[PDB]
Coordinates of C-alpha atoms in Angstrom, one line a residue:
Chain A
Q1 CA -12.0 -27.5 -11.0
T2 CA -15.3 -26.2 -9.6
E3 CA -16.7 -22.7 -8.8
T4 CA -19.7 -21.9 -6.8
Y5 CA -21.8 -18.7 -7.2
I6 CA -24.1 -17.7 -4.4
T7 CA -27.2 -15.6 -5.0
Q8 CA -29.2 -14.4 -2.0
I9 CA -32.8 -13.3 -2.7
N10 CA -34.0 -10.5 -0.4
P11 CA -30.7 -10.4 1.6
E12 CA -31.8 -7.4 3.7
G13 CA -35.4 -8.6 4.5
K14 CA -37.5 -6.1 2.6
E15 CA -40.9 -6.1 1.0
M16 CA -40.3 -7.0 -2.6
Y17 CA -43.4 -6.6 -4.9
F18 CA -43.8 -6.7 -8.6
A19 CA -46.6 -4.4 -9.9
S20 CA -49.5 -6.2 -11.5
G21 CA -48.8 -6.7 -15.2
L22 CA -45.2 -7.9 -14.5
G23 CA -46.0 -11.5 -13.6
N24 CA -44.1 -13.4 -10.9
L25 CA -40.6 -12.6 -9.6
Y26 CA -38.0 -14.8 -11.2
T27 CA -34.3 -15.2 -10.8
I28 CA -32.3 -15.7 -14.0
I29 CA -28.7 -16.8 -13.9
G30 CA -26.6 -16.8 -17.0
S31 CA -23.9 -14.9 -18.9
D32 CA -24.4 -11.7 -21.0
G33 CA -21.5 -12.6 -23.2
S34 CA -16.8 -16.2 -24.0
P35 CA -20.1 -17.5 -22.6
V36 CA -20.1 -19.7 -19.4
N37 CA -21.5 -23.2 -20.0
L38 CA -24.1 -24.1 -17.5
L39 CA -25.2 -27.5 -18.7
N40 CA -23.2 -29.3 -16.0
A41 CA -24.3 -26.9 -13.2
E42 CA -25.3 -28.2 -9.8
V43 CA -28.2 -26.2 -8.4
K44 CA -29.5 -26.0 -4.8
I45 CA -32.3 -23.6 -3.6
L46 CA -32.6 -22.8 0.1
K47 CA -35.4 -20.9 1.9
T48 CA -34.9 -19.2 5.2
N49 CA -36.1 -16.4 7.4
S50 CA -34.5 -13.2 6.2
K51 CA -33.5 -12.5 9.8
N52 CA -31.0 -15.3 9.3
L53 CA -29.1 -13.5 6.4
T54 CA -26.1 -11.3 6.1
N55 CA -23.2 -22.1 6.1
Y56 CA -26.2 -23.0 4.0
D57 CA -26.2 -26.5 5.4
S58 CA -27.5 -25.3 8.8
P59 CA -31.0 -26.2 10.0
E60 CA -32.1 -22.6 9.5
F61 CA -31.9 -23.2 5.7
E62 CA -34.6 -25.4 4.2
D63 CA -33.7 -27.2 0.9
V64 CA -36.6 -26.2 -1.4
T65 CA -34.9 -27.2 -4.7
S66 CA -37.7 -29.6 -5.6
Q67 CA -40.5 -27.3 -4.5
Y68 CA -39.4 -24.5 -6.9
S69 CA -37.2 -26.3 -9.4
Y70 CA -35.6 -24.5 -12.3
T71 CA -35.0 -24.6 -16.1
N72 CA -31.6 -24.7 -17.7
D73 CA -30.9 -24.4 -21.4
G74 CA -27.1 -24.3 -21.1
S75 CA -26.7 -20.5 -21.1
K76 CA -29.5 -19.5 -18.7
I77 CA -31.0 -21.0 -15.5
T78 CA -34.4 -19.7 -14.7
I79 CA -36.2 -19.9 -11.3
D80 CA -39.9 -19.0 -10.9
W81 CA -40.6 -17.8 -7.4
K82 CA -44.3 -18.6 -7.9
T83 CA -45.4 -15.2 -6.7
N84 CA -45.3 -11.5 -7.4
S85 CA -44.5 -10.7 -3.8
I86 CA -41.8 -11.8 -1.4
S87 CA -42.3 -10.6 2.2
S88 CA -39.8 -8.8 4.4
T89 CA -39.3 -12.1 6.4
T90 CA -38.6 -14.3 3.4
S91 CA -35.2 -14.9 1.8
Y92 CA -33.8 -17.5 -0.6
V93 CA -30.4 -18.7 -1.5
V94 CA -29.5 -20.2 -4.8
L95 CA -26.2 -22.0 -5.1
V96 CA -24.8 -22.7 -8.6
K97 CA -21.8 -24.9 -8.9
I98 CA -20.0 -25.2 -12.3
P99 CA -16.7 -26.2 -13.7
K100 CA -14.2 -23.4 -13.1
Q101 CA -14.6 -21.2 -16.2
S102 CA -13.3 -17.7 -16.8
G103 CA -15.9 -15.2 -17.8
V104 CA -18.9 -13.1 -16.5
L105 CA -22.0 -14.6 -14.9
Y106 CA -25.1 -12.6 -13.9
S107 CA -28.0 -13.2 -11.5
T108 CA -31.3 -11.3 -11.4
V109 CA -34.6 -10.8 -9.6
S110 CA -36.7 -9.8 -12.6
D111 CA -39.6 -10.7 -14.8
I112 CA -39.0 -13.7 -17.1
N113 CA -38.0 -11.4 -20.0
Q114 CA -35.5 -9.4 -18.0
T115 CA -37.1 -6.0 -18.7
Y116 CA -37.7 -5.1 -15.1
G117 CA -35.8 -5.7 -11.8
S118 CA -32.2 -5.9 -10.7
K119 CA -29.2 -7.6 -12.3
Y120 CA -25.8 -8.4 -10.5
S121 CA -22.8 -9.5 -12.5
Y122 CA -19.6 -11.2 -11.4
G123 CA -16.5 -11.9 -13.5
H124 CA -13.0 -13.3 -13.3
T125 CA -10.3 -13.3 -16.0
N126 CA -6.7 -14.2 -16.0
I127 CA -4.8 -11.3 -17.5
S128 CA -1.8 -13.6 -18.1
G129 CA 0.7 -15.8 -16.3
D130 CA 0.5 -18.8 -14.0
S131 CA 1.1 -17.0 -10.7
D132 CA -1.2 -17.4 -7.8
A133 CA -2.3 -13.8 -7.8
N134 CA -5.8 -13.9 -6.4
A135 CA -8.6 -11.7 -4.9
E136 CA -12.3 -11.7 -4.1
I137 CA -14.7 -8.8 -4.5
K138 CA -18.2 -7.7 -3.5
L139 CA -20.4 -4.7 -3.0
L140 CA -22.0 -4.4 0.4
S141 CA -23.6 -1.8 2.7
Chain B
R1 CA -26.5 8.3 3.3
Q2 CA -26.8 6.0 0.3
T3 CA -23.3 4.7 0.0
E4 CA -22.0 1.2 -0.7
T5 CA -18.6 -0.2 0.0
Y6 CA -16.7 -2.0 -2.8
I7 CA -14.6 -4.5 -0.9
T8 CA -11.6 -6.3 -2.4
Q9 CA -9.9 -9.1 -0.5
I10 CA -6.3 -9.6 -1.4
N11 CA -5.0 -13.2 -1.3
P12 CA -8.1 -14.8 0.3
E13 CA -6.9 -18.1 -1.0
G14 CA -3.9 -18.0 1.3
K15 CA -1.3 -18.7 -1.4
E16 CA 2.1 -17.3 -2.1
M17 CA 1.6 -14.6 -4.7
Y18 CA 4.9 -14.2 -6.4
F19 CA 6.0 -12.0 -9.3
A20 CA 9.2 -13.0 -11.1
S21 CA 11.8 -10.4 -11.8
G22 CA 10.8 -8.0 -14.5
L23 CA 7.2 -7.7 -13.5
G24 CA 7.8 -5.3 -10.7
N25 CA 5.8 -5.2 -7.5
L26 CA 2.3 -6.6 -7.0
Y27 CA -0.3 -4.0 -7.4
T28 CA -4.1 -3.7 -7.1
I29 CA -5.9 -1.5 -9.5
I30 CA -9.6 -0.7 -9.0
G31 CA -11.7 0.9 -11.7
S32 CA -14.8 0.6 -13.8
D33 CA -15.9 -0.6 -17.3
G34 CA -18.9 0.4 -19.4
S35 CA -21.3 4.4 -17.7
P36 CA -18.1 4.5 -15.6
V37 CA -18.4 4.6 -11.8
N38 CA -17.2 7.9 -10.3
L39 CA -14.5 7.4 -7.7
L40 CA -13.6 11.1 -7.1
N41 CA -15.4 11.1 -3.7
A42 CA -14.4 7.6 -2.7
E43 CA -13.3 7.0 0.9
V44 CA -10.5 4.4 1.0
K45 CA -9.2 2.2 3.8
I46 CA -6.6 -0.6 3.6
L47 CA -6.3 -3.4 6.1
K48 CA -3.7 -6.1 6.7
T49 CA -4.5 -9.5 8.3
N50 CA -4.3 -13.3 7.9
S51 CA -6.1 -15.0 5.0
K52 CA -7.9 -17.5 7.3
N53 CA -10.0 -14.5 8.5
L54 CA -11.5 -13.5 5.1
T55 CA -15.0 -14.7 4.6
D56 CA -17.3 -14.9 1.6
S57 CA -19.6 -12.5 3.3
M58 CA -16.9 -9.8 3.6
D59 CA -19.1 -8.5 6.4
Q60 CA -16.5 -8.5 9.3
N61 CA -15.5 -6.3 12.2
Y62 CA -12.8 -4.3 10.3
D63 CA -12.3 -2.6 13.7
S64 CA -10.8 -5.6 15.5
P65 CA -7.3 -6.8 16.5
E66 CA -7.4 -9.1 13.5
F67 CA -7.1 -6.2 11.2
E68 CA -4.5 -3.4 11.2
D69 CA -4.9 -0.1 9.4
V70 CA -2.2 0.3 6.8
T71 CA -3.9 3.0 4.7
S72 CA -1.0 5.4 5.2
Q73 CA 1.8 2.8 4.9
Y74 CA 0.6 1.8 1.4
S75 CA -1.3 4.9 0.2
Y76 CA -3.0 5.0 -3.2
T77 CA -3.5 7.1 -6.3
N78 CA -7.0 8.0 -7.4
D79 CA -7.6 10.0 -10.6
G80 CA -11.4 9.6 -10.3
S81 CA -11.7 6.6 -12.6
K82 CA -8.9 4.4 -11.3
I83 CA -7.5 3.7 -7.8
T84 CA -4.0 2.2 -7.8
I85 CA -2.2 0.6 -4.8
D86 CA 1.5 -0.5 -4.8
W87 CA 1.9 -3.4 -2.4
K88 CA 5.6 -2.6 -2.3
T89 CA 6.9 -6.1 -2.9
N90 CA 7.0 -8.8 -5.7
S91 CA 6.1 -11.4 -3.1
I92 CA 3.1 -11.7 -0.7
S93 CA 3.3 -14.7 1.6
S94 CA 0.5 -17.3 2.0
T95 CA -0.2 -16.0 5.5
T96 CA -0.6 -12.4 4.4
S97 CA -3.8 -10.8 3.1
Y98 CA -5.2 -7.3 2.7
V99 CA -8.7 -5.8 2.4
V100 CA -9.3 -2.7 0.4
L101 CA -12.5 -0.9 1.3
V102 CA -13.8 1.7 -1.2
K103 CA -16.8 3.5 0.0
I104 CA -18.7 5.4 -2.7
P105 CA -22.1 7.0 -3.4
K106 CA -24.6 4.2 -4.3
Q107 CA -24.1 3.7 -8.0
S108 CA -25.1 1.3 -10.7
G109 CA -22.3 0.0 -13.0
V110 CA -19.5 -2.5 -12.9
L111 CA -16.2 -2.1 -10.9
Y112 CA -13.1 -4.3 -11.3
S113 CA -10.2 -5.1 -9.0
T114 CA -6.8 -6.7 -9.9
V115 CA -3.8 -8.3 -8.3
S116 CA -1.4 -7.5 -11.2
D117 CA 1.7 -5.7 -12.3
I118 CA 1.5 -1.9 -12.5
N119 CA 0.3 -2.0 -16.1
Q120 CA -2.3 -4.7 -15.8
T121 CA -0.5 -7.0 -18.2
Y122 CA 0.0 -9.9 -15.8
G123 CA -2.1 -11.3 -13.0
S124 CA -5.8 -11.6 -12.2
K125 CA -8.8 -9.3 -12.7
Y126 CA -12.3 -9.6 -11.1
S127 CA -15.4 -7.6 -11.9
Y128 CA -18.6 -6.9 -9.9
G129 CA -21.6 -4.7 -10.4
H130 CA -25.3 -4.3 -10.4
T131 CA -27.9 -2.3 -12.4
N132 CA -31.6 -1.4 -12.4
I133 CA -32.9 -3.3 -15.4
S134 CA -35.8 -1.0 -16.3
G135 CA -34.3 2.1 -14.9
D136 CA -37.6 2.9 -13.1
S137 CA -37.4 4.9 -9.9
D138 CA -39.8 2.9 -7.7
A139 CA -39.9 1.1 -4.4
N140 CA -37.8 -1.8 -5.7
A141 CA -35.1 0.5 -7.0
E142 CA -34.6 1.7 -3.4
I143 CA -33.8 -1.7 -1.9
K144 CA -31.4 -4.6 -2.6
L145 CA -33.4 -7.3 -4.3
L146 CA -30.5 -9.7 -4.4
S147 CA -26.8 -10.1 -3.8
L148 CA -24.3 -12.2 -5.8
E149 CA -21.0 -13.6 -4.5
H150 CA -18.3 -16.0 -5.5
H151 CA -17.4 -18.7 -3.1
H152 CA -13.6 -18.5 -2.4
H153 CA -11.5 -21.5 -1.8
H154 CA -8.9 -21.7 1.0
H155 CA -7.1 -25.1 0.9

């Protein structure tokens, strides 16, 4: 009934800087397309030392959901990281839980207008049938 | 090196994946959408193991007793745009899972993987990809700013 999408910010502990004129780093979660409804999404934001990344309930993860907060208009969730620079030792984890819906969801580390940065997309569709054919995918180094 | 590995976990939910008569064997097809991702120089490895081992991270020791190399037993066809794997059965038990590792040159774009019939008319399909929004070749384009993953369920 529910699906959870996990977005890790600065998963490899690098210096992430947005040139002056770009504004702060933001993370936008939504669906290019059919669209995925986000009005009933459960959102949690965690902060941790990048050295910890590769269970988000562990003491190594600090719940900062209230400190950063986020906007949600039903089709896009936006998080302001409050800075144009995230140090190599800083990482965040955004958990978005929504009713199981078929479709494509995307997450970014970009400017508020999505004209600069990086965008990852994840999708699942049932070709047809009621079989329990299932898989999980991901791109990793 | 600049390579990334596109990992597909087969049956991470630990359920019996059964294809009724007429659908043929279970297959996994890996390809792209759209610029298409070039798979001509892809390095492919296939592993067999128990579903209870598959993690959301997919960052495991694929060189452990847990995993067995079945790359040759299964084999695969790769025409450069599509990789097709015949699982040789219409029934994969709840305690059987596979992991397909496709190592390719670091590229932007969206790849997809299926657990379907040979013709992709039945089953499930998943897509995953990333892209540089502005297309600028700067410091940020050289690093991974984020990662996205779907939490899998294993009842």
